[PDB]
Amino acid sequence: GASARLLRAAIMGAPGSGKGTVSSRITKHFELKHLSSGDLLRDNMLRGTEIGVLAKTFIDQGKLIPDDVMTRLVLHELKNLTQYNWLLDGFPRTLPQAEALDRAYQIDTVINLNVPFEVIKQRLTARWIHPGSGRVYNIEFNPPKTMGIDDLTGEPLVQREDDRPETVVKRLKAYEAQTEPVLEYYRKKGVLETFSGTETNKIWPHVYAFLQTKLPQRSQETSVTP
């Protein structure tokens, strides 16, 4: 369609930054292939491939899969997608992945969502479970009537170790350490576009207006016929 005009883009953002929502809306409104490296890894795992076994090992220890493995897997998929616009998501995560990618394809725009630390920390530590019933409470959307207590039984709620504040802080500092070199690398290339905000619905209009200058709105499903 857009003949020598295909978008090679990447989207970046901390866990809890709303990146997942913004990636959904981009794919809802524009004609592009969204390649998510976490989804490639889940599929390989689901299919029980050798990279699926390798990956599950690391992901269980919350580590990054080595750069060469991750780069090979992604580059193999992009080989197939050259005729489409694409949005890469979760890759590059490290500076060897970004340098490697640059030897194979020219990346035109990297979208970075910059949301304050405390906002991301509040999102990621918000979930509590009542173990007996499976009832979930999210402090932002449906808080219990008394904190740490199940509404219906009065029994205590618990939080997974992953959702605890200290664990979350640790994950965010690691993500920052990892991706800060990547952002600086795209910033020297002049391809980094940063969108800052505290709510995803205030950031989205700007990302939408920015990609509309770049690519084809998916033909017309106006579903809010309001």
Ligand X SMILES: Nc1ncnc2c1ncn2[C@@H]1O[C@H](COP(=O)(O)O)[C@@H](O)[C@H]1O
Q: Is 80 annotated as a binding residue?
A: no
* Near ligand X in 18-37, by CB under 6 A: 37
Count Cβ atoms below 10 Å from residue 176 Cβ, excluding itself.
12
List all residues 6 or more positions away from 155 whose beta carbon is below 8 Å from its beta carbon.
Answer: 130, 132, 149
Which residues are known catalytic residues?
A: 19, 93, 127, 160, 171
User: 106, 10 in Cβ contact below 8 A?
Assistant: no
User: 11, 23 in Cβ contact below 8 A?
Assistant: yes
User: 91, 37 in Cβ contact below 8 A?
Assistant: yes
Q: With binding defined as CB under 6 A, does residue 97 bind ligand X?
A: yes
Question: Which residue from 91, 137, 185, 195 is in contact with ligand X, where contact means CB under 6 A?
Answer: 91
Question: Which residue from 7, 22, 65, 101 is in contact with ligand X, where contact means CB under 6 A?
Answer: 65
Q: Are strands 109-114 and 33-36 parallel, antiparallel or unpaired?
A: unpaired
Q: With binding defined as CB under 6 A, does residue 58 bind ligand X?
A: yes
Which of these segments, 61-69, 78-86, 113-121, 218-226, binds ligand X (CB under 6 A)?
61-69
Specify which residues 136 forms β-bridges with. 129
Indicate the residue among 27 and 216 with the shorter CB distance to ligand X.
Answer: 27
Residue 186's identity, in one-letter code, is Y
Residue 78's identity, in one-letter code, is L
Indicate the residue among 38 and 148 with the shorter CB distance to ligand X.
Answer: 38
Q: With binding defined as CB under 6 A, does residue 84 bind ligand X?
A: no
List all residues 6 or more positions away from 75 whose beta carbon is below 8 Å from its beta carbon.
Answer: 100, 101, 104
Question: Which residue from 1, 38, 132, 165 is in contact with ligand X, where contact means CB under 6 A?
Answer: 38
* Interacting residues with ligand X (CB under 6 A): 37-38, 41, 58-59, 62-65, 70, 90-91, 93, 97
Q: Which residues are annotated binding-site positions?
A: 16, 18-21, 37, 42, 63, 90, 93, 97, 127, 137-138, 160, 171, 200
